[PDB]
């Protein structure tokens, strides 16, 4: 036997073709659950116990567990039987009972002899007598077959139930082999006749008479080994006989889950305990400890007193020593609960409670963490009564009075210690829970001398009014217990509490006096003094005090005689009532009869004054004059008091409130003194090399037969797409400036947009139709390719047409965002065919004619056909208000400024006004006034409007190009308006000049006068591209596309 250490636990290592026998034994018993062969100069798991020791160890193998280990010894011998295994030397010192009542039959030694000589005992001593106890269970037949093992197991069960008493020695068994010996005398030590017969059957001299372990298990199915075993506890405990549940946390987890099943199915509970307790000591995490504690709490009422006091309580203490404060509180609370479930006193629990449990909880009572002392404060009021109750139940089993006095002294010491612990909350907790009940553990004289004084010390701690209120909450209990020898000690202290600063302390002490008088614990004269002093608090501005004072005064009206009630309660209550009440004992009448309290403002302005004593001096004199004791009302010695009084009289304090500020003066000054003591870029695909347009048309394509109204350049593919009300959305090559045309979308077509990061375009129709076009103009078969790949139609009753479109590529999602007549811009994820955001527009702003979305997709601007703008924050897609138009004329076009982050260019219909509004400031801070109508005039004299905007970051100059109804295409330079000019018309067109006039803080550039190439009609588009030179691309309302190089 070599007990040694291994990475999971201890291991038994033993030393004497012999290696093959254990191979066969292992491959046979690898499935056995109540058996353990040599796992491999040999090895074996170390189990907690023996059988003999486990009989000896202090948690005693009660009869139910003895029946269980017989159950499992039979089961293990059976499992070896079916698996073709037979040990041959079963004993009490090898039926290894692990901690959780799991019976392991260990080290099957097939190298032991099958048959032995009868007269040579050396083989028995060596092979079978390892413990040298000489208790021999060799089969009577032997001097390897199944009945032999069954006989040994019957001997083992007989030894189990005989509290270790050996059933056979060597001489006894030899005499039994010759039939000469029958041991029934030892058999009379078996507790119950079922095991008597079970051993009898199994020990018979003739082997063939012995049934099988399977047979015996069949037979003993409720006479001895209850059906509850066979049903629940065999496979359930087999759950824990496997390697996965390596740690106590998991066993606690499984059993916490299985508690309901186990309890309602099962008494086998004791067996369960050997599992649960085996984990209690080794729980790792806080959740496991708390779980095991609640498990134990639920188990305990279904266990018995001996079981609890033996195997649960010491583990509860082991937790109460442990680290986690919640674990300490719960260990004490579980301890209190378990011990409360107790109603028997075993012999060895003769004086458990003073000698064992209270020492264990003492260090909790001292413990630093506040919650532990709070738990002890709440729980001593039950641990102490468990002490008294338990030591009273004990006497059914030394000088008892000495034990009781020792208990009273430990309880008294702990109460005083917890009232000395610094935390006001622990003191308050004890005073809420245990002080009342532990007074009985004091006795008067000790209580009056120690507890009352310790409580009184709290009334000194002025800072924390919670502690003083707690003192007044439990002073009722202590002054109930100590009785009549504390009223004189307390009366000034309760007057201290009533006149205290924090007014909820007054409320709690008014309740103290309420309950304390309700027990008749106050001197009759003291009752009258307190009623006369709580008279003022009825008219206190506060409401909790005012009502608590009402309660006390009613309660005194009920305790002391109505003779006393009248004679002294009424004349004290005369001021603060309104009506001459009869039923002081009716709170109803009092509360409906209290005068309105001095207003909290008046009352605080009386209290706030420093040297408030002079305030009361002048108030007192004013009273005398108002009653005639002084002839007049002179101003005081100090004009500061006259000043304060005049300020407070400016609040118009009623003279009645003056009388009341006199009446409260005692409390008033005392309280006064008490507080006295206290990767995206606006730069498009084309960076413009065409610094100055020439005003020079290179193409005159009239392919469109109706007005052309949108142009979109794309330099991903070096094309530009135009569209017109003839429904021909023509895609024109840029290198050629129609490379492709498309009309299947039908109807008027003025809106479109190229996609920034793909090969396809998107178009919009007057039908409400949104479509795409895969484009093949870089690849060249005999002809380039159009590719219709889209469908989207929307009923104009709710979804609408497309007012403008713009495609931006914000990552994996590829957003094509378009306006609607309904005005809800919509972001369709072309890469996903499901739209992303529906920016709904406030239709009161009007139809949205242009929108322009931030380059960095932070905010998109909207310009209604009313001229009233809008802005949107697209990170949250939340609206932002925007400055309207002073003229409220339709905004045709909108754009986002290149140089400026928050600057939104709107070209407004009328007077050829193009105004730059800054959204952060909410106003217009640049303006262009081409029309010679009065500058920034809302007369709108000019029919001319502007609807082509190109804004570019060229050479640090926000080069702008505006084109509209005047048939002229205008250059502007937003920094040097001296550069602006017009490129349209014939040579007969007069020249103009471009002024800078600062109006209203806003700036106004103004244009005023000093074959026709230009469009004969409204120029309704401007875009730009470049291949070698920068091209403006413009279109008219006649249907003509022109391109200016």
């Amino acid at each position: 036997v070599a007990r040694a250490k291994h990475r999971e636990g201890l291991v038994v290592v033993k030393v004497f073709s012999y290696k093959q026998e254990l191979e066969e034994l292992k491959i046979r018993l690898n499935s056995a659950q109540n058996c353990l062969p040599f796992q491999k100069m040999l090895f074996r798991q170390y189990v907690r116990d023996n059988l003999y020791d486990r009989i000896s160890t202090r948690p005693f193998l009660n009869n139910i567990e003895k029946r269980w280990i017989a159950f499992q010894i039979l089961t293990a011998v059976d499992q070896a039987h079916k698996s073709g295994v037979r040990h041959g030397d079963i004993k009490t010192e090898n039926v290894m009972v692990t901690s959780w009542n799991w019976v392991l039959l260990t080290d099957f030694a097939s190298f032991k002899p099958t048959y032995l000589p009868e007269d040579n005992p050396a083989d028995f001593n060596y092979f079978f007598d390892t413990s040298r106890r000489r208790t021999c269970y060799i089969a009577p037949e032997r001097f390897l077959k199944r009945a032999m093992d069954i006989f040994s197991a019957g001997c083992v069960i007989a030894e189990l139930f005989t509290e270790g008493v050996p059933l056979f020695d060597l001489s006894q068994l030899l005499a039994y082999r010759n039939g000469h010996f029958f041991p029934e005398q030892v058999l009379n030590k078996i507790e119950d006749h079922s095991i008597r017969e079970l051993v009898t059957q199994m020990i018979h001299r003739e082997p063939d008479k012995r049934l099988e372990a399977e047979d015996y298990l069949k037979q003993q199915r409720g006479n001895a080994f209850p059906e509850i075993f066979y049903t629940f506890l065999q496979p359930y405990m087999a759950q824990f006989a496997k390697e996965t549940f390596l740690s106590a946390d998991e066993r606690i987890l499984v059993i916490r889950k299985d508690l309901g099943n186990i309890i309602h199915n099962l008494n086998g509970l004791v067996i369960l305990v050997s599992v649960i307790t085996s984990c209690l000591q080794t729980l790792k995490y806080c959740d496991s400890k708390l779980a095991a504690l609640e498990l134990i709490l639920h188990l305990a009422p279904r266990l018995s007193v001996e079981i609890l006091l033996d195997r649960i309580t010491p583990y509860l203490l082991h937790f109460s020593n442990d680290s986690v404060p919640r674990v300490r509180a719960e260990a004490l609370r579980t301890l209190t609960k378990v011990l409360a479930l107790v109603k028997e006193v075993p012999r060895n629990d003769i004086n458990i409670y003073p000698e064992y449990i209270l020492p264990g909880i003492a260090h909790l009572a001292q413990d630093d963490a506040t919650i532990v002392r709070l738990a002890y404060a709440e729980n001593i009021a039950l641990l102490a009564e468990t002490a008294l109750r338990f030591l009273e139940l004990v006497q059914l089993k030394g000088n008892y009075d000495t034990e009781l006095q020792a208990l009273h002294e430990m309880v008294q010491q702990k109460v005083v210690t917890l009232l000395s612990d610094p935390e006001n909350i622990v003191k308050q907790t004890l005073m809420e829970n245990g002080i009342t009940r532990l007074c009985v553990f004091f006795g008067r004289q000790k209580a009056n001398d120690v507890l009352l004084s310790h409580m009184i010390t709290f009334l000194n701690d002025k800072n924390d009014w919670h502690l003083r209120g707690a003192f007044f909450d439990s002073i009722v209990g202590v002054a109930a217990y100590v009785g009549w020898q504390s009223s004189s000690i307390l009366k000034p202290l309760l007057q201290q509490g009533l006149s205290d600063a924090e007014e909820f302390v007054i409320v709690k002490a008014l309740y103290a006096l309420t309950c304390m008088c309700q027990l008749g614990l106050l001197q009759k004269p003291h009752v009258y003094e307190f009623a006369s002093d709580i008279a003022p608090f009825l008219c206190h501005p506060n409401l909790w005090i005012r009502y608590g004072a009402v309660g006390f005064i009613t309660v005194v009206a009920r305790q002391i005689s109505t003779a006393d009630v009248y004679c002294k309660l009424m004349p004290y209550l005369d001021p603060y009532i309104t009506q001459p009440i009869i039923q002081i004992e009716r709170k109803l009448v009092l509360l409906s009869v209290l005068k309105e309290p001095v207003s909290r403002s008046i009352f605080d302005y009386a209290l706030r004054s420093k040297d408030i004593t002079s305030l009361f001096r002048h108030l007192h004199m004013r009273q005398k004059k108002r009653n005639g004791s002084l002839p007049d009302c002179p101003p005081p010695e100090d004009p500061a008091i006259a000043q304060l009084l005049k300020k407070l009289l400016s609040q118009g304090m009623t003279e009645e409130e003056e009388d009341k500020l006199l009446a409260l003066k005692d409390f008033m000054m005392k309280s006064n003194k008490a507080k006295a003591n206290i990767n995206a870029e606006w730069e498009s695909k084309p960076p413009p090399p065409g610094w100055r347009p020439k005003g020079l048309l290179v193409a005159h394509l009239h392919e469109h037969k109706s007005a052309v109204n949108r142009i979109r350049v794309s330099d991903e593919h070096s094309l530009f797409a135009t569209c017109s009300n003839d429904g021909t959305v023509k895609i024109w090559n840029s290198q050629k400036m129609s490379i492709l045309t498309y009309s299947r979308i039908g109807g008027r077509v003025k809106t479109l947009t190229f996609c920034q990061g793909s090969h396809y375009l998107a178009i919009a129709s007057d039908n409400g139709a949104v479509q795409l076009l895969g484009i093949e103009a870089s690849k060249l078969p005999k002809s380039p390719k159009i590719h219709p790949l889209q469908s989207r139609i929307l009923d104009q009753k709710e979804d609408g047409c497309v007012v403008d479109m713009h495609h931006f590529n914000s990552g994996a999602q590829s957003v094509l965002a378009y306006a609607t007549v309904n005005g809800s811009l919509v972001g369709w994820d072309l890469r996903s065919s499901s739209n992303a955001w529906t920016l709904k527009h406030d239709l009161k702003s009007g139809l949205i004619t242009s929108f322009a979305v931030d380059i960095h997709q932070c905010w998109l601007c909207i310009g209604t056909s009313s001229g009233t703008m809008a802005c949107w924050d697209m990170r949250f897609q939340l609206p932002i208000s925007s400055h309207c138009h002073p003229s409220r004329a339709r905004i045709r076009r909108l754009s986002m400024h290149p140089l400026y982050q928050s600057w939104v260019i709107a070209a407004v219909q009328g007077n050829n006004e193009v105004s730059m509004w800054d959204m952060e400031t909410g106003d217009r801070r640049f303006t262009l006034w081409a029309s010679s109508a009065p500058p920034l005039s809302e007369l709108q004299p000019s029919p001319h409007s502007v609807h082509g905007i190109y804004c570019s970051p060229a050479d640090g100059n926000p080069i702008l190009l505006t084109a509209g109804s005047d048939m002229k295409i205008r250059f502007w330079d937003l920094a040097y308006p001296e550069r602006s000019y017009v490129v349209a018309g014939s040579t007969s067109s007069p020249s103009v000049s471009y002024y800078r006039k600062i109006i209203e803080g806003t700036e106004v550039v103004q244009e005023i006068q000093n074959l026709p190439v230009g469009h004969h009609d409204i120029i309704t588009d401007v875009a730009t591209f470049q291949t070698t030179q920068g091209f403006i691309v413009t279109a008219s309302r006649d249907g003509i596309v022109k391109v200016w190089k």
């Binding site: 009273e392 009075d401 109505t562 003779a563 009869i582 074959l1011 190089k1045």
Partner: protein
């Protein structure tokens, strides 16, 4: 102090406790409390019930020296008396400041100097005694007189209470009046708030509803005016259409009158004779210059600006090229006539003219098969367009 004649009475007794109670109802702790008879007059004393005990230490509470202790004990509010101690305090024996029990069913009293169990320098002068006794007697008689006064006052309180019950009913009625008044007042404030608020939003409702009616009215009238403008737009559109028809009729009339003057013709070999000159595809100079003016006027008549404008002279008609990058300021202008030292310039100039012819045909809508035919293409243009 163990002397006799030491005054020792119930007033000196403030503790009573019991030890070793053997219960006649088997092994279970009673809930024991006790009662004292004035030793057998009606008992009056009741300590709190120590539940689950048999050896209690009850909380205690007059010049009488003998009294009867009896203990009730029985669980769950049903109680049983198991004691008879008619004890004269003078018979008790003293144990020292600690209750120590050895009998069964034992009760141990507790007095000022210790505990009591059943066993097994000058004085005030007589003048002081007389003063003390007279003072105690004055206390006795004045307290008794005060008790008589108080009982008289309470009897008259009852006699007036005969109607004070109705007075208290009156107080309750006035309280009910006051409670109702405050409740009605706060409910009436709620009514005032609700009425003002509701009136406000009702006037708001009428305002916004009349606004909506006016808005619908303006929508219908606006639609009417727009439809009137629709009919006006149709009228002016058709008027422009007929005007443009007149434009193009005039344009072709004057185009033909133009076209007569510059002849073209054929030969049997399909060639183009121009005033009688052979023309292979791109005098000869004179007829070509005629074509140049022909083209320029055709631009002037058809209002289609020249891709490369023509600074027209009869035969020296030049065509300016503002568009090509590869041409400098002097290279902006090409001829349509043979210029000295500019054969390539002249050839590309006639090319540009042919491109102008292509442009004119394209703008008219006539697809041009070959762009080296100068005069044939323009003659075709006049024939067709």
């Amino acid at each position: 102090v163990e002397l006799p004649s030491q005054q020792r009475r119930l007033r000196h007794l403030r503790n009573i406790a019991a030890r070793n109670i053997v219960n006649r109802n088997g092994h279970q702790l009673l809930d024991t409390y006790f009662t004292l008879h004035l030793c057998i007059y009606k008992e009056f004393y009741r300590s709190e019930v120590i539940k689950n005990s048999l050896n209690p230490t009850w909380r205690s509470l007059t010049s009488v020296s003998c009294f009867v202790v009896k203990i009730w004990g029985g669980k769950e509010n049903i109680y049983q008396l198991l004691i008879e101690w008619k004890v004269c305090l003078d018979g008790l024996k003293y144990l020292g400041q600690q209750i120590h029990a050895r009998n069964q069913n034992e009760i141990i009293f507790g007095l000022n100097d210790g505990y009591y169990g059943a066993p097994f320098r000058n004085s005030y002068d007589v003048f002081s005694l007389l003063r003390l006794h007279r003072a105690q007697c004055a206390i006795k008689q004045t307290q008794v007189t005060v008790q008589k006064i108080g009982k008289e006052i309470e009897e008259k309180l009852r006699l007036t209470s005969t109607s004070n019950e109705l007075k208290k009913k009156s107080e309750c009625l006035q309280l009910k009046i006051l409670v109702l008044q405050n409740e009605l007042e706060r409910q009436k404030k709620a009514l005032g708030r609700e009425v003002a608020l509701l009136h406000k939003q009702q006037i708001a409702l009428q305002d916004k509803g009349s606004a909506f009616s006016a808005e619908h009215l303006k929508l219908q009238l606006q639609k009417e005016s727009l439809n009137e403008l629709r009919k006006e737009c149709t009228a002016k559109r058709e008027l422009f259409l007929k005007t443009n028809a007149q434009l193009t009729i005039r344009c072709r009339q004057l185009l033909s009158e133009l076209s007569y003057i510059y002849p073209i013709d054929l030969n049997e070999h399909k060639d183009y004779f121009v005033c009688g000159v052979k023309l292979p595809n791109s005098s000869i100079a004179v007829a070509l210059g005629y074509t140049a003016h022909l083209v320029s006027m055709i631009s002037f008549f058809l209002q289609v600006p020249l891709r490369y404008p023509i600074i027209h002279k009869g035969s020296r008609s030049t065509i300016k090229d503002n568009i090509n990058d590869k041409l400098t300021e002097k290279e902006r202008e090409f001829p349509l006539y043979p210029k000295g030292g500019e054969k390539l310039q002249f050839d590309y100039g006639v090319y540009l003219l042919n491109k102008n012819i292509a442009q004119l045909r394209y703008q008219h809508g006539l697809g041009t098969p070959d762009l080296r035919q100068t005069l044939p293409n323009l003659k075709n243009f006049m024939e067709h367009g």
